[PDB]
Write an enzyme that holds these catalytic residues in place. Structure first.
Site, PDB file in Angstrom:
ATOM      1  N   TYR A   1      51.363  32.980  51.113  1.00 33.70           N
ATOM      2  CA  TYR A   1      51.206  34.566  51.414  1.00 33.70           C
ATOM      3  C   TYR A   1      50.359  35.345  50.608  1.00 33.70           C
ATOM      4  O   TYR A   1      50.731  36.418  49.931  1.00 33.70           O
ATOM      5  CB  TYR A   1      52.583  35.099  52.028  1.00 33.70           C
ATOM      6  CG  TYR A   1      53.402  35.799  51.023  1.00 33.70           C
ATOM      7  CD1 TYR A   1      54.305  35.382  49.950  1.00 33.70           C
ATOM      8  CD2 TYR A   1      53.675  37.168  51.264  1.00 33.70           C
ATOM      9  CE1 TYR A   1      55.315  36.139  49.196  1.00 33.70           C
ATOM     10  CE2 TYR A   1      54.855  38.068  50.592  1.00 33.70           C
ATOM     11  CZ  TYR A   1      55.338  37.323  49.537  1.00 33.70           C
ATOM     12  OH  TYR A   1      56.614  37.953  49.110  1.00 33.70           O
TER      13      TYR A   1
ATOM     14  N   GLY B   1      46.730  36.848  51.575  1.00 38.08           N
ATOM     15  CA  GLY B   1      45.875  37.727  52.275  1.00 38.08           C
ATOM     16  C   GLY B   1      46.542  39.251  52.141  1.00 38.08           C
ATOM     17  O   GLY B   1      46.695  39.464  50.727  1.00 38.08           O
TER      18      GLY B   1
ATOM     19  N   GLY C   1      49.607  41.757  53.006  1.00 37.09           N
ATOM     20  CA  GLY C   1      50.891  41.577  54.030  1.00 37.09           C
ATOM     21  C   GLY C   1      51.503  40.337  53.769  1.00 37.09           C
ATOM     22  O   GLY C   1      52.245  40.052  52.625  1.00 37.09           O
TER      23      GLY C   1
ATOM     24  N   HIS D   1      50.081  42.014  43.404  1.00 41.06           N
ATOM     25  CA  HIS D   1      48.754  42.608  43.474  1.00 41.06           C
ATOM     26  C   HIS D   1      48.223  42.663  45.035  1.00 41.06           C
ATOM     27  O   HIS D   1      47.254  43.780  45.072  1.00 41.06           O
ATOM     28  CB  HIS D   1      48.121  41.530  42.527  1.00 41.06           C
ATOM     29  CG  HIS D   1      46.494  41.046  42.887  1.00 41.06           C
ATOM     30  ND1 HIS D   1      46.300  40.019  43.446  1.00 41.06           N
ATOM     31  CD2 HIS D   1      45.333  41.682  42.180  1.00 41.06           C
ATOM     32  CE1 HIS D   1      44.608  39.951  43.110  1.00 41.06           C
ATOM     33  NE2 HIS D   1      44.325  41.063  42.482  1.00 41.06           N
ATOM     34  N   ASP D   2      48.535  42.073  45.811  1.00 46.21           N
ATOM     35  CA  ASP D   2      48.092  42.327  47.285  1.00 46.21           C
ATOM     36  C   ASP D   2      48.771  43.362  48.056  1.00 46.21           C
ATOM     37  O   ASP D   2      48.271  43.755  48.805  1.00 46.21           O
ATOM     38  CB  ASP D   2      48.172  40.950  48.402  1.00 46.21           C
ATOM     39  CG  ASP D   2      49.666  40.224  48.407  1.00 46.21           C
ATOM     40  OD1 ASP D   2      50.423  40.992  49.329  1.00 46.21           O
ATOM     41  OD2 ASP D   2      49.525  38.785  48.323  1.00 46.21           O
TER      42      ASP D   2
ATOM     43  N   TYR E   1      47.184  46.388  46.069  1.00 48.09           N
ATOM     44  CA  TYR E   1      45.776  46.380  46.940  1.00 48.09           C
ATOM     45  C   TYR E   1      45.934  47.000  48.479  1.00 48.09           C
ATOM     46  O   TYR E   1      45.386  47.730  48.815  1.00 48.09           O
ATOM     47  CB  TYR E   1      45.159  45.042  46.993  1.00 48.09           C
ATOM     48  CG  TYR E   1      44.464  44.554  45.832  1.00 48.09           C
ATOM     49  CD1 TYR E   1      44.726  45.002  44.452  1.00 48.09           C
ATOM     50  CD2 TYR E   1      43.621  43.564  45.943  1.00 48.09           C
ATOM     51  CE1 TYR E   1      43.458  44.565  43.154  1.00 48.09           C
ATOM     52  CE2 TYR E   1      42.614  43.130  45.314  1.00 48.09           C
ATOM     53  CZ  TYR E   1      42.555  43.732  43.699  1.00 48.09           C
ATOM     54  OH  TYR E   1      41.494  43.265  43.021  1.00 48.09           O
TER      55      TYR E   1
ATOM     56  N   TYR F   1      35.578  49.622  36.794  1.00 44.13           N
ATOM     57  CA  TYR F   1      36.521  49.374  35.995  1.00 44.13           C
ATOM     58  C   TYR F   1      36.170  47.976  35.111  1.00 44.13           C
ATOM     59  O   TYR F   1      35.792  47.226  35.595  1.00 44.13           O
ATOM     60  CB  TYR F   1      38.005  49.461  36.227  1.00 44.13           C
ATOM     61  CG  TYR F   1      38.553  48.367  37.308  1.00 44.13           C
ATOM     62  CD1 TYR F   1      39.167  47.307  36.734  1.00 44.13           C
ATOM     63  CD2 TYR F   1      38.367  48.487  38.639  1.00 44.13           C
ATOM     64  CE1 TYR F   1      39.863  46.070  37.537  1.00 44.13           C
ATOM     65  CE2 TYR F   1      39.163  47.501  39.493  1.00 44.13           C
ATOM     66  CZ  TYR F   1      39.673  46.592  38.918  1.00 44.13           C
ATOM     67  OH  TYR F   1      40.269  45.558  39.607  1.00 44.13           O
TER      68      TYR F   1
ATOM     69  N   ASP G   1      45.394  44.912  39.720  1.00 44.47           N
ATOM     70  CA  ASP G   1      44.713  43.805  38.856  1.00 44.47           C
ATOM     71  C   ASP G   1      45.089  43.398  37.320  1.00 44.47           C
ATOM     72  O   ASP G   1      44.811  42.268  36.740  1.00 44.47           O
ATOM     73  CB  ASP G   1      43.165  43.933  38.877  1.00 44.47           C
ATOM     74  CG  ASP G   1      42.221  43.039  39.162  1.00 44.47           C
ATOM     75  OD1 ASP G   1      42.259  42.399  40.121  1.00 44.47           O
ATOM     76  OD2 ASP G   1      41.328  42.701  38.027  1.00 44.47           O
TER      77      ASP G   1
END
Ligand SMILES: [Ca+2]
Length: 124
Positions: A28, A30, A32, A48-49, A52, A73, A99
């Site tokens: 998983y 991507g 969501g 991190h997703d 994002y 950054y 990140d």
């Protein structure tokens, strides 16, 4: 783009390899995704997703600014200790704080050797 993210995960990761091993693996990764992971190193892609996800919403530098993932950054280290450019602002701060957990948490999680370019009718 996402490329001073590879600079990022050398900094935070005593031992384990970045993207070259990491970006293919687990169920998983991507936006969501939710089964669960497989092992929890798709679980460091989870945080991190979904940070994002809060970047597509983001009021500080807002997304008619289409994808501000490094031209904007860079970062600090060095236990792991990843953060940001150390003035750290509003939106330079937010996308480097997603990140960061990226970089740190590939050193925090149990790794996918296994899901490493995955299966999932299996893990998820
Ligand atoms: Ca996902």
């Amino acid at each position: 783009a996402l490329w001073q993210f590879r600079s990022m995960i050398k900094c935070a990761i005593p031992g384990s390899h970045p993207l070259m091993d990491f970006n293919n693996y687990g169920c998983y990764c991507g936006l969501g995704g939710s089964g669960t992971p497989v092992d929890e190193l798709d679980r460091c892609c989870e945080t991190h997703d979904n940070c994002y996800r809060d970047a597509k919403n983001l009021d500080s530098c807002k997304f008619l600014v289409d994808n501000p993932y490094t031209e904007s950054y860079s970062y600090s280290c060095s236990n792991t200790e990843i953060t940001c450019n150390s003035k750290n602002n509003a939106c330079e701060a937010f996308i480097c704080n997603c990140d960061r957990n990226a970089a740190i948490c590939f050193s925090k999680a149990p790794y996918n050797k296994e899901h490493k370019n995955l299966d999932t009718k299996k893990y998820c």
